[PDB]
Design an enzyme around this catalytic site. Structure first.
Site, mmCIF file in Angstrom:
data_model
loop_
_atom_site.group_PDB
_atom_site.id
_atom_site.type_symbol
_atom_site.label_atom_id
_atom_site.label_comp_id
_atom_site.label_asym_id
_atom_site.label_seq_id
_atom_site.Cartn_x
_atom_site.Cartn_y
_atom_site.Cartn_z
ATOM 1 N N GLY A 31 3.105 -8.755 -9.569
ATOM 2 C CA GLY A 31 3.771 -8.446 -10.798
ATOM 3 C C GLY A 31 3.037 -8.425 -12.189
ATOM 4 N N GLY A 44 6.163 -12.699 -5.298
ATOM 5 C CA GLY A 44 5.253 -11.343 -5.815
ATOM 6 C C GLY A 44 5.495 -11.077 -7.151
ATOM 7 N N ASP A 45 6.613 -11.319 -7.798
ATOM 8 C CA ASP A 45 6.564 -11.278 -9.225
ATOM 9 C C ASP A 45 5.433 -11.913 -9.964
ATOM 10 O OD1 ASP A 45 10.078 -11.172 -9.516
ATOM 11 O OD2 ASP A 45 8.710 -9.410 -8.969
ATOM 12 N N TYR A 47 17.738 -6.976 -7.728
ATOM 13 C CA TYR A 47 17.731 -8.315 -8.457
ATOM 14 C C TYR A 47 19.185 -8.990 -8.654
ATOM 15 C CZ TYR A 47 12.681 -9.342 -8.589
ATOM 16 O OH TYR A 47 11.570 -9.496 -8.264
ATOM 17 N N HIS A 107 0.717 -1.207 0.090
ATOM 18 C CA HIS A 107 0.069 -0.026 -0.031
ATOM 19 C C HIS A 107 0.968 1.277 -0.091
ATOM 20 C CE1 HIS A 107 -3.555 -2.596 1.812
ATOM 21 N NE2 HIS A 107 -3.272 -2.812 0.376
ATOM 22 N N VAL A 140 9.847 -13.674 -1.221
ATOM 23 C CA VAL A 140 9.344 -12.307 -1.025
ATOM 24 C C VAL A 140 9.270 -11.689 -2.671
ATOM 25 C CG1 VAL A 140 9.451 -9.771 -0.376
ATOM 26 C CG2 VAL A 140 9.457 -11.590 1.321
ATOM 27 N N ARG A 141 10.405 -11.517 -3.175
ATOM 28 C CA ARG A 141 10.451 -11.101 -4.732
ATOM 29 C C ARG A 141 9.870 -11.951 -5.668
ATOM 30 N NH1 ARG A 141 10.416 -5.939 -5.644
ATOM 31 N NH2 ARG A 141 9.846 -6.961 -7.648
#
EC number: 1.14.14.18
Lengths: 207, 209
Positions: free
Chosen positions: A134, A129-130, A47, A19, A125-126
């Site tokens: 994403g 999420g992607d 990355y 958010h 997490v990354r």
């Protein structure tokens, strides 16, 4: 199991990170290609650090089946950046924001200590999420801002055919990862940190 | 007895030590393995000096049963630092911070004066702190910084079956030390000094974080 506890344990940090004003404004069409490109340039910096940590941890034999090389984004992202910026100019122009400096520091420390649990936290997490949020970002960058999907390869994962299956199997692997009590606490601690790092990256983008 | 008086005597200095910003941030997970490693490098320096002073006082025949050689931490710590740093490099890089210099100088004076009472104070401050709260610190270093349990040899006492019984017996040995009023008072004052030295060690470690 772990996947569930992982979601629950990070719920607060995750909601805060999702958010962010910058990310909220980007996704609702209030920003533009320029802000999207700034995001992607900071992402390339982190990355790059993330996948060095991932390479060290996979090489060490920890969590091998989770650490799918197909997820690697740095190379695809640089090509996205060449397309967004019109050339490789960005490589010598860009610099890590304060938040990105801290995030890269953690990913480098993780790499240096070959910290398997920590790395898995940051990977979940990354990449998870992607493969979820994403996808919304890619669709919206095209719809709101007219970004050519040629500059959205970051969100396309080759030789991953079905995202739902992929995400379900990922969480099953998490559930089957052998961890000591301390390693599992560490993974949970790091996953919260990973969300907070990303929230701060978004906060710097908005400033 | 003495073990009770020590606790009461040193409660102000003791709490200040424990609540330093460096240790607080460390235990909350705000620092990193680098900071832990720095701590352990400084500790290797003062434990080295401490254990030279212990060796001296033990050899003199003073408080022999208290001065259990299985408490020795310097060698175990060097092995932890070998694993944390990834090489032997650190043995020649590391240098005492200003508070560690003062702390070591005191320990060295205690060694050379073979000062039994003052030695016992420093033994109490360090080793009973290790026995009492070491497990908490080790747990925090894995939780927060992913430290290999094999690089926390410092917080494990091989020679000691059960820490509870051991701590209780340690306190009883203190209580059983035959000390004159002058020796007891010298020891008590020294024990506050020792807590102060450690606090100052943490202060140094926290500068510029």
């Amino acid at each position: 199991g772990l996947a569930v506890e992982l979601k629950q344990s990070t719920a607060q940090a995750h909601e805060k990170a999702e958010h962010s004003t910058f990310m909220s404004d980007l996704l609702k069409g209030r920003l533009g290609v320029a802000e999207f490109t700034r995001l992607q340039e900071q992402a390339w910096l982190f990355y790059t650090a993330l996948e060095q940590a991932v390479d060290a941890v996979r090489a060490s034999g920890f969590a091998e089946s989770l650490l799918d090389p197909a997820l690697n984004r740095a190379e695809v992202l640089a090509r996205d950046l060449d397309k967004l910026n019109g050339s490789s100019e960005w490589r010598s122009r860009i610099t890590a924001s304060p938040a990105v400096i801290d995030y890269v520091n953690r990913l480098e420390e993780i790499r240096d200590n070959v910290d398997g649990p920590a790395l898995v936290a940051h990977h979940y997490v990354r990449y998870l999420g992607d493969l979820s949020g994403g996808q919304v970002i890619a669709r919206m960058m095209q719809r709101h801002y007219g970004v050519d999907p040629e500059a959205l390869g970051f969100y396309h994962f080759e030789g991953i055919a079905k995202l739902k299956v992929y995400k379900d199997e990922y969480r099953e692997k998490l559930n089957n990862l052998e961890l000591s009590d301390e390693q599992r606490e560490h993974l949970l601690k790091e996953a919260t940190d990973a969300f907070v790092f990303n929230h701060q990256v978004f906060a710097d983008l908005g400033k």
